[PDB]
Design a protein around this motif. Structure first.
Motif, PDB file in Angstrom:
ATOM      1  N   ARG A 168      48.324  47.931  35.753  1.00 13.18           N
ATOM      2  CA  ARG A 168      48.125  47.634  37.173  1.00 13.18           C
ATOM      3  C   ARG A 168      49.433  47.592  37.977  1.00 13.18           C
ATOM      4  O   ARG A 168      49.405  47.641  39.197  1.00 13.18           O
ATOM      5  N   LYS A 169      50.571  47.432  37.311  1.00 14.53           N
ATOM      6  CA  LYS A 169      51.860  47.417  38.024  1.00 14.53           C
ATOM      7  C   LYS A 169      52.073  48.768  38.701  1.00 14.53           C
ATOM      8  O   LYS A 169      52.666  48.824  39.773  1.00 14.53           O
ATOM      9  N   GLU A 170      51.511  49.804  38.080  1.00 12.14           N
ATOM     10  CA  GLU A 170      51.489  51.189  38.582  1.00 12.14           C
ATOM     11  C   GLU A 170      52.871  51.870  38.765  1.00 12.14           C
ATOM     12  O   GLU A 170      53.881  51.225  39.028  1.00 12.14           O
ATOM     13  N   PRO A 171      52.929  53.215  38.637  1.00  8.44           N
ATOM     14  CA  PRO A 171      51.846  54.154  38.307  1.00  8.44           C
ATOM     15  C   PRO A 171      51.422  54.133  36.828  1.00  8.44           C
ATOM     16  O   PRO A 171      50.244  54.039  36.530  1.00  8.44           O
TER      17      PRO A 171
ATOM     18  N   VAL B  63      44.702  38.513  26.969  1.00  5.21           N
ATOM     19  CA  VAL B  63      45.059  39.922  26.818  1.00  5.21           C
ATOM     20  C   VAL B  63      44.243  40.775  27.771  1.00  5.21           C
ATOM     21  O   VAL B  63      44.779  41.619  28.471  1.00  5.21           O
ATOM     22  N   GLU B  64      42.951  40.504  27.829  1.00  4.60           N
ATOM     23  CA  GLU B  64      42.028  41.252  28.678  1.00  4.60           C
ATOM     24  C   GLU B  64      42.501  41.310  30.135  1.00  4.60           C
ATOM     25  O   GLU B  64      42.257  42.286  30.832  1.00  4.60           O
ATOM     26  N   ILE B  65      43.197  40.273  30.584  1.00  3.63           N
ATOM     27  CA  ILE B  65      43.695  40.232  31.952  1.00  3.63           C
ATOM     28  C   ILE B  65      45.133  40.755  32.056  1.00  3.63           C
ATOM     29  O   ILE B  65      45.458  41.517  32.959  1.00  3.63           O
ATOM     30  N   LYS B  66      46.020  40.302  31.178  1.00  7.05           N
ATOM     31  CA  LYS B  66      47.432  40.630  31.306  1.00  7.05           C
ATOM     32  C   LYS B  66      47.831  41.965  30.804  1.00  7.05           C
ATOM     33  O   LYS B  66      48.694  42.595  31.379  1.00  7.05           O
ATOM     34  N   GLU B  67      47.291  42.352  29.676  1.00  5.71           N
ATOM     35  CA  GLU B  67      47.767  43.547  29.026  1.00  5.71           C
ATOM     36  C   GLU B  67      47.282  44.751  29.829  1.00  5.71           C
ATOM     37  O   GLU B  67      48.004  45.713  30.023  1.00  5.71           O
ATOM     38  N   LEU B  68      46.099  44.612  30.418  1.00  6.78           N
ATOM     39  CA  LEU B  68      45.583  45.606  31.369  1.00  6.78           C
ATOM     40  C   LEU B  68      46.342  45.471  32.687  1.00  6.78           C
ATOM     41  O   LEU B  68      46.489  46.418  33.447  1.00  6.78           O
TER      42      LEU B  68
END
Length: 26
Positions: free
Chosen positions: A21-24, A12-17
């Protein structure tokens, strides 16, 4: 069996954040 629990949250710490990151926004 703490090692198995930790691995779930570590995903979760990597993916959900990673969605932000896909932005905006998401």
């Amino acid at each position: 069996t703490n090692r198995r629990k930790s691995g779930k949250y570590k995903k979760v710490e990597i993916k959900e954040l990673g969605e932000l990151r896909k932005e905006p926004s998401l």
